[PDB]
Design a protein around this ligand. Sequence first.
Ligand code: NAP
Ligand code: NAP
Lengths: 433, 433
Amino acid sequence: QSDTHIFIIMGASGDLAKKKIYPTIWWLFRDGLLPENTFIVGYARSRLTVADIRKQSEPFFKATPEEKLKLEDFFARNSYVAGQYDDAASYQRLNSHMNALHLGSQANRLFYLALPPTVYEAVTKNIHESCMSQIGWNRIIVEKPFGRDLQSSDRLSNHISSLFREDQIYRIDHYLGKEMVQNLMVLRFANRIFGPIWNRDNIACVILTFKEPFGTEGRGGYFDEFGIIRDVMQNHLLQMLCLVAMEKPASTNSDDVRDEKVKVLKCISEVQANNVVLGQYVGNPDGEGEATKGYLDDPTVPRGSTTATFAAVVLYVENERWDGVPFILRCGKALNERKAEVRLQFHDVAKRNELVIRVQPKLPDAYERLILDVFCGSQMHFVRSDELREAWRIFTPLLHQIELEKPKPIPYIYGSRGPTEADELMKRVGFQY
Amino acid sequence: QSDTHIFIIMGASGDLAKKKIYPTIWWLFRDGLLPENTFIVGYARSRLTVADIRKQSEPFFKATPEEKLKLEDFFARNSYVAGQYDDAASYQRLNSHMNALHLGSQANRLFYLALPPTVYEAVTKNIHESCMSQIGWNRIIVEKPFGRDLQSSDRLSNHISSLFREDQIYRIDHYLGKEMVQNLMVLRFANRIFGPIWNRDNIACVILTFKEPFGTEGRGGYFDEFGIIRDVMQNHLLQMLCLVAMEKPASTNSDDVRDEKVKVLKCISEVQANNVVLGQYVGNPDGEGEATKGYLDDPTVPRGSTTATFAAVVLYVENERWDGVPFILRCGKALNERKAEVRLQFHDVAKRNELVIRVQPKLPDAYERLILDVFCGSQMHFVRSDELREAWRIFTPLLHQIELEKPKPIPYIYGSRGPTEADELMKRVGFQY
Ligand SMILES: NC(=O)c1ccc[n+]([C@@H]2O[C@H](COP(=O)([O-])OP(=O)(O)OC[C@H]3O[C@@H](n4cnc5c(N)ncnc54)[C@H](OP(=O)(O)O)[C@@H]3O)[C@@H](O)[C@H]2O)c1
Ligand SMILES: NC(=O)c1ccc[n+]([C@@H]2O[C@H](COP(=O)([O-])OP(=O)(O)OC[C@H]3O[C@@H](n4cnc5c(N)ncnc54)[C@H](OP(=O)(O)O)[C@@H]3O)[C@@H](O)[C@H]2O)c1
């Protein structure tokens, strides 16, 4: 709204800030992609200085010796405030420090909640009363997990949105690849092209695939508390199902396309276990490297976890355009390839034909383009509150059933395509009407 | 029309019969794909016996020792008649020999003109009066060249069709690959699918590609009398342009789809030299094998031939569906890859997007399926007389200009993508309307 932006990294001492946030804002500043008059303010309990953050974070900058002048300028625009996350006087110190900066009264304020959502409720509250800007805009970036089921997510989201309008809430998701936004970009363009063709009439079956060739790799501990449905399917695969099935948006406003996505979601009823095949990856005997270790063989995994590392799920959009048309969401870790495709099978009058859409896995990458979108205010590649609510409604009964019955997942060897029961399930839904 | 078929190989002593016709009918008979009561009658001037043909042709059968019983039966259904191609008594001997066979009076008669078209005028005449069947159907297979320009082709075609109805004339073309019919099959299916999308509105540019990685290889002599336009473009690439641009056929009759193809051709005006880039391949210095030899370095090529071995051409379909939409026909020998694709570029509102259709280069191959089509009477993958006339009309002014002015083709190294002037020409027709 003006020329002066303050980038507040709430929880600047942590892993996400050290390894990712600080490096990518350094890159955006270096490549000249930030607003010229930008200040960076870390905020966290541990008593640090800008020098400490530089010490522990510049290793990840890939800083070359001919970049040292812009790098010194960058850290000259940097500052750090210690404080507690529910302490009034602490947020007072933060707010007045920001007011002290050049044009800071005025300035736009972008809060990055690099914190476990467990503290979100406190932070979003205190910001709301203490640190919001009176002139410039205020935009909060919230991070996964957006809850773990419909109930928890509704609690967290109702809290956040009772304090900020939806054009201030940016739910960010970026851990699946540098090519991650181009996926949705080309699926939007492809929906615009192929709209008149994408019917129940021409299409018999739609499969969306996210295969990764690596395992959990010494971090199965974190993954185990969520599952492959929460990690890849409920958020990403579901959005690209939306982008495939949606109608022509009213325009290219972020909100018309998000309206169409939510209109899609409101016609998918809740997925049930018979339409689901869960799998867990085991070590490769004859392979080598991280392949000799399986999932349970990761030290950080609790003994005997039934957490699925692979899932195949069948959804149905239930309107006049798509009915009895099965949408097959297939994803998993430690597979054969690193594939991220969308196939659409057709009705022949001949073998059987099929259209394929692949991201071969514009120079700003996924997370970089996302931070630039929050700067520009382009909310397109962020999930809206109702979109999130509908996703969680679709998947919560199933996740609850898993957590209750601990259904033993189907084992598959590191490097396999996955359980053959998944191919069984695909073969089963040859609807033919 | 019954159960008894007589396969007459006119000119059975020659290369096409020895190396291809006799082997593939052996394969069709072996795999049980011929009518049960089929007889094979070779006819040619040189005084041979069935034993001689077996001697000189079984080497190409890939006959295994457990196939010798069906092979003996096959040659038991074989017979050979010597005669001249414009000698009345010779065709009398042929006709009465056929009448002597079991049910031969009755029998369907399939004449394969394995002969240089220079004698076609005689053969088709004599057959017409002497050897046609009174009960069964009569079908003639004519072979390339179908003339070399509009005038010669009209002469030969008017002669052939003043004696046979068009549902008796099968113009066969099969020298570009075993996967050659599946190309047109999938392009027909794709036109049926994407019809509502293929407009001037969504598509900005359509390119059709036929790259081969090998040279002429010791046979540049034959190629040199025709050119890459006559070899690949005027016949094959042009038909698949037809299959892309055509309207929805009235049905799946061979003749409704061929009607739509001809309707396409009648709206392409004659290609002119400024929209054409000709190229000729030279030896690869640092490569090896047939790559060290160029085109002129083939001994069978006349010294100093300007014959193009690569051509890039721009056509325009001129109706309401396609207007100012450039169709780029790009083909050539001794290139980098063995690609056979169709690309369709779109109109963005973003880089630039594009749909691709590739034959990855149903168990009966190209030529095998073609002979089975002439048996079944499926004229779909054969060019009709008006289709041929229109193709020749499109390309004859250009070919005449080349033969007159001997324009020195652009040299390109064995293994290259081709002349960069071809990429220039593609870049030039960014129409933008
Ligand atoms: N794939 C994924 O889903 C994924 C991957 C990476 C990160 N994330 C998300 O990124 C966000 C940031 O995570 P992170 O990687 O930066 O980890 P983090 O180190 O746990 O959090 C960063 C900072 O949070 C503060 N903190 C952590 N636990 C706390 C607690 N219980 N009470 C109070 N303060 C606490 C600490 O600051 P002080 O000690 O100075 O107060 C710490 O330096 C989280 O929401 C996480 O879910 C998600
Ligand atoms: N890519 C292509 O375009 C391509 C490739 C291969 C073949 N073809 C076509 O296939 C057809 C058959 O050709 P082919 O490969 O079998 O070659 P071919 O050996 O020239 O012809 C086969 C037989 O034709 C007879 N013959 C040849 N020239 C003659 C002449 N001037 N007068 C009378 N009889 C003559 C001979 O039989 P007798 O001596 O016993 O009478 C010879 O054994 C031709 O139309 C040719 O264009 C096209």
